[PDB]
Amino acid sequence: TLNPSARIMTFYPTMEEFRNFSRYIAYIESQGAHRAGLAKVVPPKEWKPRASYDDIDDLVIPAPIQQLVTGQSGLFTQYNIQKKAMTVREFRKIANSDKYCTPRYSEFEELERKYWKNLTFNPPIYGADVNGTLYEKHVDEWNIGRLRTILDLVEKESGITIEGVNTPYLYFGMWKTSFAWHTEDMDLYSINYLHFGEPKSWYSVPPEHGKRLERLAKGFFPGSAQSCEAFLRHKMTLISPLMLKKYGIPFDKVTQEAGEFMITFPYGYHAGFNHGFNCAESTNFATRRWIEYGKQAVLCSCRKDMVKISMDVFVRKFQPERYKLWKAGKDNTVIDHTLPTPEAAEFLK
Amino acid sequence: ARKSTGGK
Ligand SMILES: O=C(O)CNC(=O)C(=O)O
Ligand SMILES: [Cl-]
Ligand code: NI
Ligand SMILES: [Zn+2]
């Protein structure tokens, strides 16, 4: 009904609207935001998660990754090679040096063409997956370390911590560092805050067209598909927007600036790249709507110790009527990707 | 397990 084009929406909450995170996600879903797979939320001007970023040069990036990319004609495979630990001061120097710094350009479309032209050359280092938060401890609004969503049931009931999923990660970017096409682990939501630096650019495919992207990718990389159903979960697959266009896959793009949040929605495929030196913070989260996606997520089996969350506690608490059916393997619920989460009822009444 | 940016 809402957002029939499934385009990426941008929201400008007041501080009063901003305060309750889970409630605001329910709101943006009542406006159809989830249909795009990706949304931007620009927080109120008064809001700041940290007073200054002057004190982080000594922060250690324990496992920076050099991103080797192979391919041509809009189809690539990215190999992430772990380098030795380095400090943020050491990373920033390399990021801003003549060898790695952002090229000169006029319009964004020019920078994007240079990205897709040059991504296999001069492999960059991405300071990815760093355990930590740059939020100050007093910040109660949209705090990536404590969003208070039902994803908290995992740790609360089982004691299980899954780094980056129910804890925060930092990402130190340089020019041409990339994230491959993926949905989140267990098809969760994600939140991404750009603390400082140059922009991060995103592509998204509506969840309602996700299966179409998978079929396409399977055809483009038939060997990877035969060795693992969920091979996109390896996060090694890059596909240009020209290729998506050429094969009729609906998608949108958006650029995230310093100070801005992005939200990804269950089964919303996304990929992108950093423009230059920057720092993002991110984690996963859930709403009641996610539980069915969690139940039905197609997971990677071919690699050891991949992220798998027991859905039992969620089905018992929030779907008691279906619990026995689901344990018997007879729960044939079909997901409607257009429907907002039940918690949005407040805003739809 | 943990979340990862990608593999090789
Ligand atoms: O910033 C990155 O490298 C990629 N981020 C995400 O995939 C996310 O926030 O869901
Ligand atoms: Cl292949
Ligand atoms: Ni993601
Ligand atoms: Zn796999």
Active site residue A268: no
Tokens for A234? 């390896």
Can you spell out the DSSP letters for A112-163? HHHHHHHTTSS--EEEEEEE---S-TT--SS-TT----GGGHHHHHH----B
Distances A48 to A63, A138, A142, A333 between C-alpha atoms, Å: 28, 11, 10, 42
The span from the CA of A84 to the CA of A79, in Å, is: 16
Strands A38-41 and A9-11: parallel
Is A182 annotated to bind ligand? yes
HEC assignment per residue over A150-207? HHHHHHHHHCCCCECCCCCEEEEECCCCEEEEECCHHHCEEEEEEEEECCEEEEEECH
Closest residue by CA, ligand 1 atom 3 = A179
> Tokens 């340089």 label which residue?
A174
The span from the CA of A170 to the CA of A29, in Å, is: 26
Tokens for A98? 């003549």
State whether residue A277 is helix, strand or coil: coil
Q: How was this structure determined?
A: X-ray
Radius of gyration of chain B (CA): 6
State whether residue B4 is helix, strand or coil: coil
Residue in A27, A115, A135, A171 annotated catalytic: A171
Of residues A286, A1, A161, the one with CA closest to residue B1: A161
Active site residue A184: yes
A-to-B residue pairs, Cβ atoms closer than 8 angstroms: 50
The span from the CA of A326 to the CA of A310, in Å, is: 13
Q: Within 10 A of A272 (CB to CB), how many other CB atoms are there?
A: 24
The span from the CA of A309 to the CA of A164, in Å, is: 13
The span from the CA of A237 to the CA of A271, in Å, is: 9
Chain center to CA of A69: 20
Q: Within 10 A of A55 (CB to CB), how many other CB atoms are there?
A: 10
HEC assignment per residue over A293-327? HHHHCCCCCCCCCCCCCCCHHHHHHHCHHHHHHHH
Q: Which ligand is nearest to the CA of A218?
A: 2
Closest residue by CA, ligand 1 atom 2 = A179
Please report the domains of chain A, with CATH numbers, ordered by start residue: 8-349 (2.60.120.650)
Breaks (C-N over 2.5 A) in chain B follow: none
Of residues A5, A197, A19, the one with CA closest to residue A91: A197
Would you say A41 and A11 are in contact if contact means Cβ atoms under 8 Å apart? yes
